[PDB]
Amino acid sequence: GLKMFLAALSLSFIAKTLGAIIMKSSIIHIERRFEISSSLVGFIDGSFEIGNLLVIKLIGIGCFIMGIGGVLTALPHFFMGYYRYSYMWIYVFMGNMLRGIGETPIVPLGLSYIDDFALYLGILNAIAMIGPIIGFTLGSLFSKMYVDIGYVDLSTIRITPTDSRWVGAWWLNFLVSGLFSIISSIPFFFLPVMFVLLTLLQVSSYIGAFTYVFKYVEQQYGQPSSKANILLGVITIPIFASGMFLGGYIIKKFKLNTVGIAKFSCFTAVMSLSFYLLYFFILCENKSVAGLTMTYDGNNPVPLSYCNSDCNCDESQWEPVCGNNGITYISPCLAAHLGECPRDDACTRKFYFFVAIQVLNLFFSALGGTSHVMLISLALGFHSMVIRALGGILAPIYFGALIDTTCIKWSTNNCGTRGSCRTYNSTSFSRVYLGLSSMLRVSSLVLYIILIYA
Amino acid sequence: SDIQMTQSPSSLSASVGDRVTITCRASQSVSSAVAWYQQKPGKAPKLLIYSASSLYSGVPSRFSGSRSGTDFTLTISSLQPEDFATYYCQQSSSSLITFGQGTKVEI
Amino acid sequence: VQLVESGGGLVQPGGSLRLSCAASGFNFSSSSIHWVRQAPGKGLEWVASISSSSGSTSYADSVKGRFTISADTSKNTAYLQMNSLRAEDTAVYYCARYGWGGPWYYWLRDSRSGIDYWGQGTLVTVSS
Ligand SMILES: CC(C)CCC[C@@H](C)[C@H]1CC[C@H]2[C@@H]3CC=C4C[C@@H](OC(=O)CCC(=O)O)CC[C@]4(C)[C@H]3CC[C@]12C
Ligand SMILES: C[C@]12CC[C@H]3c4ccc(OS(=O)(=O)O)cc4CC[C@@H]3[C@@H]1CCC2=O
């Protein structure tokens, strides 16, 4: 008769597996409304690890606390003004921290009470990966709506999702998440050395890359939030589950007792880096944004235009146009129609190659992703805590720092520009993003080699 | 139903920058679904206020509508030269509409 | 965005007639088109309604029946076919849409009230 208890903890785990999938998708939308540089979205994201460090039947209370955290995460939107077509993001930060609190006694006490009473971890993690695809599809459905929906006639909106300034309804994501957490809290109230470095220098890459994959697929390739969301949701997550299952299937398929698992970890890492260094050869050439990379006339890299030197237009505001030739100018003052110049069909076709390479990379990672815990008692806890703390808090911070080192035009808000980046010099974007990722991967690989040697 | 609406004033003489208080009365079945329109000669009416509190996006912020008991009211905060026209108070419910005889302001 | 009515003339007393209203810019299906009348130098009045693709015919307790309100959803048109306009129907008929109501978080307690967009209309006067 424990099956009801099992279903209760399953509904508990669904909320935790939904949380990150929600936050890292909301990060791109909550950067343009509060108009904050991309170095503080790192801190907002790291707040969720900050709370977990701070807090480091009863297993159910955390679910209601998380519902509270998510509802407080969305509460700023109701009690606030309108976003043009502040020191207020604090709530969001506080909110996220609250979330982390609930996350503390939920995951471990589950297995703890599970091993005492009466495979269970197996079936639980099997039914675990559901929430991610649910959340990815919800994000694909909500990244189609505005930010102040229910309060403005959508037809009077002029921005489009392919445009830069557009921001969706993230508060609804947090709201549905918190409501699900509250509901999942309802039943429990009635129910009764070198290896840590090796793994850190690999997990930091994954967390940063997930935090900024949408920034990449939106500024080098022409893919909005909805398409890239549902394409990872429908495709990449079932294959991730297939890899996680094949991990345990392989452990039984061949006896990888001690040297076998080491060889397998080296193998999965090498296959990862082998299928991950191909993003360079799928690279589409950068777009032409005059006045920021190339001068108004001629092709060379603030020497104002000869034609615009006479006109007394105003710098520092993004409202673009698309010349018939394929060059985008900053605003009609400086010079076809309102919008930008989308890339040729070449990049739109290359995006599917990007998708296939991403699927294959996540796959070849998922094989060792499960064997890692098999390889390594309190040391498990120390490794877990260290990777969580350092990766979570530090990855989006340094990633955002460098990505902010490559941002041509910014926005001004009454002072101190520090406005959300509204155009990226795409080649520098590729260099920085892929370079940090690849250098970190190889830094982990050399440690793998040293370990398997010893 | 049998929803009616009456409109007591029929010729007002407010001056510039005043607080005219045009007031319609709900005869039967107060529905809290009123709307106040404005019409100039030989043109098509526009929406000033709907549900007696909100406004139409584009309308000057002077016009203030309010609900009290059974007699809705419309106060023009301060008249202007582009305001002297006819004002209609309409009521609607579950696909049945009823209109009013209109207050005509003048000087 | 724009709603234009066409048809209407000086039909002799008795007989029938039909007026059409075309509109594009909004989903022509999910927009409760309404007909409203204004006699010469008088108040307004409501005539009919087609809430959606569904008929949902509803009329006025003074001229009910003699009118029929239909719609060609494929041809994005609203139709009002009238019979025996005797003397009182002389007016300047207007099409209209129930505009987007106020902020849809707390205006579900109150029903739909506003009327956003209006056509210029043309007379359907009737006499001998
Ligand atoms: C403080 C505690 C008690 C939580 C309160 C939550 C409510 C404020 C939420 C729950 C359901 C929400 C609604 C769910 C869905 C919608 C539809 C959404 O889209 C539309 O209405 C479509 C508009 C259009 O198509 O033009 C607008 C917001 C709204 C009304 C939401 C408004 C806010 C609501 C009422
Ligand atoms: C599979 C996943 C959804 C999104 C995933 C992702 C997406 C892009 C990404 O960027 S990439 O540079 O590795 O392409 C990395 C990852 C790493 C894993 C991460 C999640 C683990 C749980 C989950 O539901």
Helix (H) or strand (E) holding C53: none
Domain range C2-97, its CATH number among 1.10.1370.30, 2.60.40.10, 1.10.10.10, 3.90.1150.10:
2.60.40.10
| Residue C104 forms contact with A (CB below 8 Å) | yes
Q: Within this chain, do residues A147 and A265 fall inside the same structural domain, yes or no?
A: no
Q: Within this chain, do residues A234 and A97 fall inside the same structural domain, yes or no?
A: no
Using CA atoms, how far residue B59 sits from A305, B38, B47, B48, B54, in Å, is 41, 11, 9, 7, 11
Closest residue in A to C27 (Cα–Cα): A155
Chain B CB contacts of C61 below 8 Å: none
| Cα torsion angle, A329, A334, A335, A337, sign | positive
How many interface pairs between B and C have CB atoms less than 8 angstroms apart? Answer: 72
Helix (H) or strand (E) holding A453: helix A426-453
Q: Within this chain, do residues A382 and A428 fall inside the same structural domain, yes or no?
A: yes
Task: Let me know: does B97 contact B1? Beta carbons within 8 Å.
Answer: no
| Residue C103 forms contact with A (CB below 8 Å) | yes
Q: Within this chain, do residues A97 and A220 fall inside the same structural domain, yes or no?
A: no
CB count in 10 Å sphere of residue A370: 19
Closest residue in A to C1 (Cα–Cα): A155
Q: Is C102 in contact with B37 (Cβ distance < 8 A)?
A: no
Q: Is A210 in the pocket of ligand 2 (CB under 6 A)?
A: yes
Q: In whole angstroms, give the CA distance from residue A224 to residue A163.
A: 9
Q: What technique was this entry resolved by?
A: cryo-EM
Q: Whose CA is nearest to atom 34 of ligand 1?
A: C105
Pairing outcome for strands B46-50 and A327-329? unpaired
| Residue C25 forms contact with B (CB below 8 Å) | no
Q: Which residue has the tokens 């035009």?
A: A409
Q: Within this chain, do residues A35 and A116 fall inside the same structural domain, yes or no?
A: yes
Q: Within this chain, do residues A272 and A415 fall inside the same structural domain, yes or no?
A: yes
Q: Is B33 in contact with C111 (Cβ distance < 8 A)?
A: yes
Domains of chain B (ranges; CATH) run 6-107 (2.60.40.10)
CB count in 10 Å sphere of residue A345: 8
| Cα torsion angle, A23, A26, A27, A30, sign | negative
Helix (H, G, I), strand (E, B) or coil at A112: helix
Ligand 1 center from residue A189 Cα (angstroms): 28
Ligand 2 center from residue A236 Cα (angstroms): 8
Q: In whole angstroms, give the CA distance from residue A323 to residue A301.
A: 19
Task: Let me know: does A376 contact A265? Beta carbons within 8 Å.
Answer: no
Q: What is the resolution of this structure in A?
A: 3.6
Q: Within this chain, do residues A56 and A100 fall inside the same structural domain, yes or no?
A: yes
Q: Is B95 in contact with C58 (Cβ distance < 8 A)?
A: yes
Q: Within this chain, do residues A265 and A414 fall inside the same structural domain, yes or no?
A: yes
Q: Within this chain, do residues A211 and A293 fall inside the same structural domain, yes or no?
A: no
Task: Let me know: does B30 contact C107? Beta carbons within 8 Å.
Answer: no
Chain C CB contacts of A157 below 8 Å: none
Q: Within this chain, do residues A337 and A349 fall inside the same structural domain, yes or no?
A: no
Ligand 1 center from residue A150 Cα (angstroms): 7
Report how many domains make up chain A: 3
Query: What contacts A36, CB < 8 A, 6 or more positions away?
Result: A89, A418, A420
Q: Within this chain, do residues A118 and A259 fall inside the same structural domain, yes or no?
A: no
- Which of A138, A142, A149 maximizes ligand 1 atoms within 8 Å of its Cβ, making it the mutation to test the pocket? A149
Among the bound ligands, the one closest to the CA of A152: 1
Q: Within this chain, do residues A47 and A180 fall inside the same structural domain, yes or no?
A: yes
Closest residue in C to B102 (Cα–Cα): C43
Task: Let me know: does A214 contact A225? Beta carbons within 8 Å.
Answer: yes
What strands lie across the sheet with C33-38, from one edge to the other?
Answer: C44-50, C33-38, C94-97
- Host domain of residue A235: 194-284+344-454
Helix (H, G, I), strand (E, B) or coil at A171: helix
CB count in 10 Å sphere of residue B71: 14
Query: What contacts C87, CB < 8 A, 6 or more positions away?
Result: C13, C126, C127
A3 burial level (CB within 10 Å; 0-12, 13-18, 19+): exposed
Query: What contacts A304, CB < 8 A, 6 or more positions away?
Result: none
Q: Is A155 in contact with C26 (Cβ distance < 8 A)?
A: yes
Task: Using the 3D structure, point to which of A342, A363, A387 is the last residue of a domain.
Answer: A342
List all residues whose CB is within 6 A of at least one atom of ligand 1: A 149-150, 154; C 104-105
Among the bound ligands, the one closest to the CA of A182: 1
